[PDB]
Amino acid sequence: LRACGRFFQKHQGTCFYFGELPLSLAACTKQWDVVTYLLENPHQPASLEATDSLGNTVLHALVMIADNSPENSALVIHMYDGLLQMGARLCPTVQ
Amino acid sequence: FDRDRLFSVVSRGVPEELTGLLEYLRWNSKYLTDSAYTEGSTGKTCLMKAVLNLVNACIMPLLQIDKDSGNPKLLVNAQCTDEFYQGHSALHIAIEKRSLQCVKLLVENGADVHLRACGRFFQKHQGTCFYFGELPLSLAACTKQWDVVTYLLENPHQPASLEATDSLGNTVLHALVMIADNSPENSALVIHMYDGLLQMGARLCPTVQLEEISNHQGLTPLKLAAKEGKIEIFRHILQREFSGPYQPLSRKFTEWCYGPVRVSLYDLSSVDSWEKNSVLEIIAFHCKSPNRHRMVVLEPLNKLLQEKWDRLVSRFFFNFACYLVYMFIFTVVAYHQPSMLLLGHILILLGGIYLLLGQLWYFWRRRLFIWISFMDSYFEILFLLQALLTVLSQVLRFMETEWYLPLLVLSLVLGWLNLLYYTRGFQHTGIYSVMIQKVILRDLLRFLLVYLVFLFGFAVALVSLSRYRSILDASLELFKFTIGMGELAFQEQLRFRGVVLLLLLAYVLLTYVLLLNMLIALMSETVNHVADNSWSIWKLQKAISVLEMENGYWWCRRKKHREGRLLKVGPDERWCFRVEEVNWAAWTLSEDPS
Amino acid sequence: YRSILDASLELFKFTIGMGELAFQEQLRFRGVVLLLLLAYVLLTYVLLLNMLIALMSETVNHVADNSWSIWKLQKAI
Amino acid sequence: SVLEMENGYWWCRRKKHREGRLLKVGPDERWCFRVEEVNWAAWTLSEDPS
Ligand SMILES: C=C(C)[C@@H]1CCC(C)=C[C@H]1c1c(O)cc(CCCCC)cc1O
Numbered sequence: 001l002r003a004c005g006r007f008f009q010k011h012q013g014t015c016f017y018f019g020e021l022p023l024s025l026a027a028c029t030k031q032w033d034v035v036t037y038l039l040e041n042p043h044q045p046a047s048l049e050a051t052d053s054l055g056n057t058v059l060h061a062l063v064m065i066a067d068n069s070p071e072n073s074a075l076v077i078h079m080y081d082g083l084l085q086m087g088a089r090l091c092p093t094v095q
Numbered sequence: 096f097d098r099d100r101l102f103s104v105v106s107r108g109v110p111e112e113l114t115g116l117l118e119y120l121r122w123n124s125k126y127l128t129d130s131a132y133t134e135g136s137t138g139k140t141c142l143m144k145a146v147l148n149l150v151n152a153c154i155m156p157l158l159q160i161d162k163d164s165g166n167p168k169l170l171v172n173a174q175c176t177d178e179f180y181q182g183h184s185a186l187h188i189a190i191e192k193r194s195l196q197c198v199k200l201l202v203e204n205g206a207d208v209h210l211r212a213c214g215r216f217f218q219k220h221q222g223t224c225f226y227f228g229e230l231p232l233s234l235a236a237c238t239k240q241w242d243v244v245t246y247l248l249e250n251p252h253q254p255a256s257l258e259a260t261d262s263l264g265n266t267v268l269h270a271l272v273m274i275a276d277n278s279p280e281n282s283a284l285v286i287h288m289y290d291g292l293l294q295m296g297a298r299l300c301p302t303v304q305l306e307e308i309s310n311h312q313g314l315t316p317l318k319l320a321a322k323e324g325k326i327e328i329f330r331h332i333l334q335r336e337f338s339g340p341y342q343p344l345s346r347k348f349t350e351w352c353y354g355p356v357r358v359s360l361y362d363l364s365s366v367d368s369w370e371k372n373s374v375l376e377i378i379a380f381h382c383k384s385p386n387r388h389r390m391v392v393l394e395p396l397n398k399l400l401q402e403k404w405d406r407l408v409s410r411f412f413f414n415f416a417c418y419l420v421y422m423f424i425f426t427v428v429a430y431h432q433p434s435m436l437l438l439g440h441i442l443i444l445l446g447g448i449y450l451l452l453g454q455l456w457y458f459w460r461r462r463l464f465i466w467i468s469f470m471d472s473y474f475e476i477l478f479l480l481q482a483l484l485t486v487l488s489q490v491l492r493f494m495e496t497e498w499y500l501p502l503l504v505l506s507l508v509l510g511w512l513n514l515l516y517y518t519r520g521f522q523h524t525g526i527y528s529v530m531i532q533k534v535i536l537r538d539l540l541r542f543l544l545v546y547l548v549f550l551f552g553f554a555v556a557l558v559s560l561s562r563y564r565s566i567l568d569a570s571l572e573l574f575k576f577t578i579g580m581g582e583l584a585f586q587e588q589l590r591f592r593g594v595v596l597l598l599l600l601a602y603v604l605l606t607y608v609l610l611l612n613m614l615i616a617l618m619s620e621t622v623n624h625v626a627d628n629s630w631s632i633w634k635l636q637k638a639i640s641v642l643e644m645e646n647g648y649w650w651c652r653r654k655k656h657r658e659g660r661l662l663k664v665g666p667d668e669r670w671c672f673r674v675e676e677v678n679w680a681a682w683t684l685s686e687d688p689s
Numbered sequence: 690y691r692s693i694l695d696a697s698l699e700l701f702k703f704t705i706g707m708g709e710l711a712f713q714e715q716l717r718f719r720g721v722v723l724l725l726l727l728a729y730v731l732l733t734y735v736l737l738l739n740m741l742i743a744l745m746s747e748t749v750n751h752v753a754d755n756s757w758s759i760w761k762l763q764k765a766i
Numbered sequence: 767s768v769l770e771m772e773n774g775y776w777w778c779r780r781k782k783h784r785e786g787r788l789l790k791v792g793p794d795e796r797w798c799f800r801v802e803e804v805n806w807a808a809w810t811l812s813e814d815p816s
């Protein structure tokens with residue numbers, strides 16, 4: 001399900017652009033346990049290649065939320081490699 | 096004997112020597128509290144001496160023997176009569192000595208916990224003094240004795256009153272503000288006591304709002320902190336949050352949280368400029384502390400001022416445009432001073448009266464601001480000076496004095512100086528204008544006095560020795576060396592040709608010493624300059640500008656809307672200002688974000 | 690002193706150190722024009738030196754790597 | 767500057783008073799200079815402050 005509201009869009013005012021998918025929300029909020037369960041759910045697994053309203057994937061959302069802060073940079077970097085590592089096991093063919 | 100006998104005994108603390116002559120108090124018909132036994136130098140009594148020497152095992156027997164005699168005035172409530180040390184009691188000594196046990200004995204024996212020490216030592220003096228307030232309750236809080244104050248407030252007999260005021264109307268919270276000195280140790284001491292008293296205030300006096308109590312000068316503890324310059328305690332009070340039991344005691348709340356995005360609700364009970372005599376008005380004008388600019392950059396104050404500034408940018412630039420149009424007429428009228436010219440002079444006369452009335456009203460509203468901080472209101476006098484001269488110049492023209500032309504052009508050049516006042520509205524040159532007077536003018540004034548001493552000192556010697564012809568001309572020629580147009584040469588017709596050149600050569604060398612050292616003198620100011628200090632001054636300058644123009648023009652006192660939104664916290668309604676922040680290291684009033 | 694172009698041109702010559710200030714004897718207001726001219730000369734020293742100080746802080750509070758990185762970007766473009 | 771001018775002018779060698787107050791420490795009398803300071807991190811010859 002996609003949250004295409006004005007609050008979830010990249011606004012200059014009040015907003016929070018975590019992407020558009022529940023999978024992106026878990027990655028942007030630093031919940032490794034949720035995303036692992038969502039991807040490896042035996043029923044209705046989340047798709048890594050699912051795109052947002054702007055075409056952004058899970059990896060794209062990690063780039064947008066980056067703010068070069070020392071805490072944020074560790075959050076984005078740690079999630080980026082983890083999703084890539086999990087991507088090989090889940091979708092080896094998809095780059 | 097008697098006075099000398101008792102003081103020596105109580106100093107050692109032996110109660111055995113105290114036994115005997117106790118019945119002599121009734122036999123001699125003399126009271127212990129009377130002037131015979133207390134020292135006439137300062138009114139100090141034996142009980143005060145006993146409390147001073149420590150717990151003195153003689154405290155209880157001394158109070159025991161007093162009640163045996165018939166004393167109309169209780170000894171434990173005796174007050175020192177010395178003017179310098181007036182109002183001090185044995186209870187104050189026990190609190191000062193950090194003796195919790197001693198305080199208990201006096202309190203359990205009927206000590207008054209509301210005695211006021213109104214001596215010169217306890218007043219806010221520039222010399223020797225210690226202003227802890229005026230009450231025993233305030234002394235414990237200011238001396239960082241949490242055990243004493245808890246016992247005093249929760250004493251089963253004669254509990255201390257939190258709302259008791261000092262001689263200046265200061266309460267316990269007010270005394271904490273005054274003793275603050277922004278020191279890292281002092282700030283922790285004041286902050287820790289301030290929240291503790293507030294937390295204990297809810298349990299003891301739930302109905303009484305201690306924060307809203309004002310002293311004899313009508314200042315709440317939050318307002319008093321802003322005026323006195325105590326930024327450290329002021330920052331803590333401005334944004335304050337607590338747990339569930341003390342949630343209403345807080346001032347900063349969270350409306351909703353969604354991931355890293357958070358919104359904060361700072362209270363504006365006495366901070367918003369809508370209410371008369373607010374924190375913003377006190378900080379900008381009434382406050383005179385050197386660290387005045389460090390307050391307007393606080394977390395809730397910076398956002399509130401920026402929000403107010405944006406809503407009045409057009410009005411600020413409208414005034415600048417109107418003033419610019421005023422000088423478009425003024426410059427042309429001055430250029431063609433000797434049909435529409437009569438219309439031009441009419442508009443100039445009205446313009447001069449217009450600014451004169453507005454500036455007079457500005458000075459009528461506030462006068463201490465100019466005296467307290469001349470640097471902040473430097474342009475206030477200049478606008479008044481230009482307006483007064485322009486109005487006066489038009490009067491002389493109508494009076495047929497023929498004396499107006501020098502004055503009319505003076506307002507032209509002086510007014511164009513006032514155009515630089517509006518440069519504070521631009522972030523680029525507004526910060527740049529800070530060093531125009533704050534950094535440069537604070538030291539370059541001294542050089543001018545030095546230069547004229549050298550200029551006139553050499554000018555008299557040059558003209559006298561050469562008799563180059565007049566004092567005005569000799570000084571004028573010496574001044575031309577500064578602009579690089581000086582004419583030095585070996586005169587052949589001079590009576591002393593070599594000597595006048597030597598003095599002239601000496602003068603030229605001194606200016607290079609003077610000018611380069613002046614360049615070096617102000618060099619250190621730029622090198623040893625804090626970047627945030629210059630930025631903070633500009634923020635204060637905008638804060639003063641918006642506050643003055645928020646009241647509207649002099650003829651039209653336009654009503655001001657109240658910033659913030661009224662909403663219920665939990666049923667109490669408090670106006671709050673939304674501040675939205677994003678925190679990624681974090682790993683609610685309402686549920687749905689808005 | 691006679692035309693707006695000439696008066697501004699003479700005032701500009703003070704910046705290059707070629708300004709001609711003197712006590713005129715034929716002027717109707719001899720002392721007043723000198724006072725305004727003297728005031729103008731003082732302001733340029735305030736203006737120019739403060740401008741030297743204003744850009745002084747940029748050099749003092751300057752990062753060495755920042756200037757070098759700009760040149761690398763310039764070559765990259 | 768103050769030391770040179772404390773001796774007075776050349777013609778009039780004015781007498782100089784002794785700074786400080788004579789008082790007993792404990793019986794030894796030593797001139798002392800009062801310095802008053804406020805310390806909030808601390809948490810006596812005479813009893814009564816003056
Ligand atoms: C070094 C400086 C700052 C200037 C720079 C220009 C030149 C040629 C002269 C130098 C100079 C001296 O080197 C020494 C003095 C002191 C002598 C004055 C009284 C005899 C003045 C003096 O302008």
Ligand SMILES: C=C(C)[C@@H]1CCC(C)=C[C@H]1c1c(O)cc(CCCCC)cc1O
Nearest residue numbers: 539540542543546730731732734735738
């Ligand atoms: C110290 C500076 C920066 C310059 C250096 C050269 C000399 C002789 C003048 C000094 C000076 C003042 O010391 C003060 C002012 C302000 C007065 C202007 C309006 C009356 C200007 C002004 O150039």
Ligand code: NA
Nearest residue numbers: 578579705706
């Ligand atoms: Na030059």
